[PDB]
Amino acid sequence: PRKMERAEGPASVLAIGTAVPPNVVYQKDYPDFYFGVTNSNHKTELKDKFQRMCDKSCVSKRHLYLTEEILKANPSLCAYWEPSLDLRQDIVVVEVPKLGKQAASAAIKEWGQPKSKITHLIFCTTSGVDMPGADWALAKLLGLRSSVKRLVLYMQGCYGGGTVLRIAKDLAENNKGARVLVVCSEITAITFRGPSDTHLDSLVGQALFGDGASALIVGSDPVPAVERAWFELHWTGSDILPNSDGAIDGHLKEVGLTFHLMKDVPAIISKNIGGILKDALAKVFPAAAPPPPTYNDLFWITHPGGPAILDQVEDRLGLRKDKLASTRAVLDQFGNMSSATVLFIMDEMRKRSVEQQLGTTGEGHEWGLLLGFGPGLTCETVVLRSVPLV
Amino acid sequence: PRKMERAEGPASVLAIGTAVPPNVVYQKDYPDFYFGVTNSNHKTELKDKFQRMCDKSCVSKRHLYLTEEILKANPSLCAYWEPSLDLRQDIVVVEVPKLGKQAASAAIKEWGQPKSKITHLIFCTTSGVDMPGADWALAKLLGLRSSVKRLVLYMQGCYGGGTVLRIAKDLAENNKGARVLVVCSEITAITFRGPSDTHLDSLVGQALFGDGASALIVGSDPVPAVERAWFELHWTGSDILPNSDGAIDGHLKEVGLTFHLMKDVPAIISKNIGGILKDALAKVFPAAAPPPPTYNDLFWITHPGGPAILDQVEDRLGLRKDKLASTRAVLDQFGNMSSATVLFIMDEMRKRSVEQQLGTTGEGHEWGLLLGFGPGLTCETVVLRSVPLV
């Protein structure tokens, strides 16, 4: 007999909550707001480039903690390269767990069980670092039991929504009764800065990144007629894509978090993703036996790093345009919320599936993929099973 | 019929490697070196405080990446409060994975299996942050498979050696054939600063903290006559101690990593540890059945945050004076190396047990405790089983 009993069934998503800052910035307004608040309106050619980036972003609106009032009170955030980190940390070490608490409370409310039943916490963010960390802060805000087993995943970046599921799978499955609270919370105050015409890749982030937090309850063996599974975690993989050193770098500097991109992140992802998914599906559906579903028969929860990534993955895999509809809906209404985004998309998908009276929580499809992409270049792959509806 | 097959036996430590910077700094020399290099010899009462901290440290020597040459070339490190973070990061983002590579290569050599059989990586450090992180850097330096499942645990602090085992346990046990490389690597260049008489708590670190990296191979179901288990992981727990808000804080600032560190941390830990261990042992050895071993029939791998912690725990728990001998030997020869220290002690203990021809890898005792303490105040408790010798 093991000294810690393990669970039997697959780790399952039992609830999803989300939260965003109340301030909404419409993309139509953003070039004028951003170049005005950063005192950059003399940079007319650069502003024209940024206008084109926003026009092509496939982002209609974003929720941002930062407001004009906060920016006017804190000029070091509006410069391109001024010492700020201490100010940025003072903000996000508080606001990242606070936003995470709102998402977690929503997940716990849906779950419907006492928060004392939570045994583990995973907190993922790319926004700030501290000791004790955002996991400790969230546990205190929520009133979790003092013996909850916590894990803080800092400086993860845009693949982190995959990472938290890959870790939560083993916590839930190897511990009988475990209920894992998973929180991803992202606030762009850590990276916001003024524009620079020698760093056009930093402008990309200004057009795409939004704020938000998402939370899950993950556990194996849901209690019948009490808990409800929405998705099951069945297979995980992680890959460093070949020839991708430096494709996406991010450094925590005295001026805050800075990013350095390569212009064909979309090419690197789209040229390698097919081989990764073919191998994953072959391992989940081995011949010896049902064949893998085809790509267009899966449901897709894909990190929308930018519209060009989505377009090129679509093209190379032969996806029909509607496969990424839920993904694009979140990008359109929230922007790129880094690690939190795929869980917003998971929530969007199950909600659309219920509303449209489809046969499963994954748009009627049995099997599906959650994909995160980020610094490395790292690709996180999670093979999911939906749950039948009514 | 799991899509990912799980393992059967307890997660086991199959190899341990360690590495330290070659520069050895003897504690008897350190007050004069430190106050000399920071231009502080006129601070006579402050130097007397530091002299007594060193005299009572129970640290005879430490290994430090920083040298007199590096300090003289980088005077912002020798002041108490000067912007330095970018310089410190430039050092530790590179040197922390480099030191980790040395420890990992030693562990892999002992393990004796090809590195391509490593399936997972956990990298823990309190020294620097970057994207991609120290996990990515170590994987690239070692040439691990591109599909290794990585996890970077940043800004953990001194409980991280317990945390990495808590996570590795579930990675190893829930994944058939998984072999987890676990690395903790710490370099005090992130925190070194000049002395200040309003911040004696910072001086504490200058007397105690040293540099080092440790690496484990962790896996379930070791291959008979091929792999060798040294310790087994059987039970894990984590607790936030009551009335401990602010006891150990650490902030990543523009001046580097800063610590705020309360007097009687030792009292908080020693007031609470008995109830935590009585609870843990009661869960590992439940009545329904052999009783828990007594404290003095366990082996002890205790994070030596400072000698006062060890002395007060030893007193409160009634430990015989030799129970903490392996722990105090690592403190004496290496200082407090943050999350890496307990793995150095685990290595020291198995080596003493072999050399002295004792009955198990835990000094002849069957069961034992690994304890990490850090910001929270967080206590990580791991109940280990030794392995019988010859």
Ligand SMILES: CC(C)(COP(=O)(O)OP(=O)(O)OC[C@H]1O[C@@H](n2cnc3c(N)ncnc32)[C@H](O)[C@@H]1OP(=O)(O)O)[C@@H](O)C(=O)NCCC(=O)NCCS
């Ligand atoms: C940013 C994006 C919306 C621009 O859309 P696009 O029309 O497809 O590409 P365009 O070539 O017209 O780009 C518009 C401008 O952005 C510039 N640009 C785009 N990506 C850039 C980068 N990484 N670095 C510097 N400049 C960049 C282009 O050079 C162009 O400038 P120009 O109009 O002065 O020539 C799109 O390229 C994208 O979605 N990228 C996905 C990858 C990514 O950026 N994601 C972030 C990471 S997780």
Ligand SMILES: CC(C)(COP(=O)(O)OP(=O)(O)OC[C@H]1O[C@@H](n2cnc3c(N)ncnc32)[C@H](O)[C@@H]1OP(=O)(O)O)[C@@H](O)C(=O)NCCC(=O)NCCS
């Ligand atoms: C080793 C050491 C620091 C002990 O020396 P000691 O037995 O206490 O001897 P002394 O009392 O002469 O201490 C030397 C000086 O350190 C100071 N000091 C010790 N702990 C301190 C703290 N947390 N903050 C500020 N000053 C501290 C003492 O006050 C004293 O200076 P004083 O002249 O102002 O009285 C000791 O207090 C220790 O081990 N502390 C535990 C430290 C700890 O919590 N470390 C864990 C991790 S980062």
